[PDB]
């Protein structure tokens, strides 16, 4: 269903303004400042470790979540930290890139939701006792 044409128009205005403030050393919100920090930790992660992203592995919509819920379980098998959370995110990005490489676009919407609910039910806790997101921003910003 379609929402407000004004909420649409406001959402873009609000996006283009944060970006300009983040560049000039400001931030619209804690959410805005965290997003950009993760975007850049991500590219930094991509750069440092491009080798390990290659062709990852019978990717079909069939056993997609199954094969997914297991890699992540294994990822944090013995604990969370700021680097594994980044390792976590960058992992979803390639899945989404490699998926649309097979028109399996339909797999992208589902992927997002597996992360959001995992990060909510499992990553969210750690993150919270360990300083918060504000703390990440400091370690990983710029």
């Amino acid at each position: 269903p379609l929402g407000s044409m004004s909420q649409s128009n406001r959402e873009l205005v609000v996006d283009f303004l944060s970006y300009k403030l983040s560049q000039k050393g400001y931030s619209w919100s804690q959410m805005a400042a965290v997003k950009q920090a993760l975007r850049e930790a991500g590219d930094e992660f991509e750069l440092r470790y491009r080798r390990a992203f290659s062709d990852l592995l019978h990717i079909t919509p069939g056993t997609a979540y199954q094969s997914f819920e297991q890699v992540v379980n294994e990822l944090f098998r013995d604990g969370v930290n700021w680097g594994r959370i980044v390792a976590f995110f960058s992992f979803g990005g390639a899945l989404c890139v490699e998926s649309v490489d097979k028109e399996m676009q339909v797999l992208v919407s589902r992927i997002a939701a597996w992360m959001a609910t995992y990060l909510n039910d499992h990553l969210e806790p750690w993150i919270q006792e360990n300083g918060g997101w504000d703390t990440f921003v400091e370690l990983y910003g710029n």
Binding site: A52, L56, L57, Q70, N73, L75, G83, V86, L139
Partner: peptide
Amino acid sequence: PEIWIAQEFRRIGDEFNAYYARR
């Protein structure tokens, strides 16, 4: 197959964590 990859992501994601942790 997979398991080895999850392990790999645990590793490089630690080298990374180590980096910004040392800073």
